[PDB]
Amino acid sequence: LNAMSRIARMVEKKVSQHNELTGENISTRRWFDKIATKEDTKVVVKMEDFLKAQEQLTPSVSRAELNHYEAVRANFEGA
């Protein structure tokens, strides 16, 4: 999703640029349809994308202390 966001902001630049170049009335969907290329799939991804995503949101489902003490207690009481 972070990758898709970056590429998306890139094209958001592109469209604006062309709107300044060829005409401001060109629709985003029209532009992205006409100038479409096989390289549209170039959803750029890199380590920095992953690190940004990890540090940005969703640390985990259950990480802090819940897992640890249930794990140890459950193993202990299973003897």
Added chain:
Amino acid sequence: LKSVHRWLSAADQSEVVPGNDNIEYFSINEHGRREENRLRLKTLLQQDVVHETKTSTSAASELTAVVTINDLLEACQETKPSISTSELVKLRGIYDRFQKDR
């Protein structure tokens, strides 16, 4: 609201003092009548009824209503914080518990 209240209070006499030239009046055989200003107004209203029109002209926004900081700060003085001060702590705690778990 405070600014518009003050403006309305100050503007009460603006439309009353000036004379009206939209129609001209001769005032013959006016003796025996105690009312003077109301009778003039009723004559003007009669003529306007004979010559009534619906169109009206626009006016500058600032002289209808305007916002000023002097009243803004006083309005801020009469505080009304929505969040219950005793409940902000509880809300913060529950929000954090939701955020970290589930």
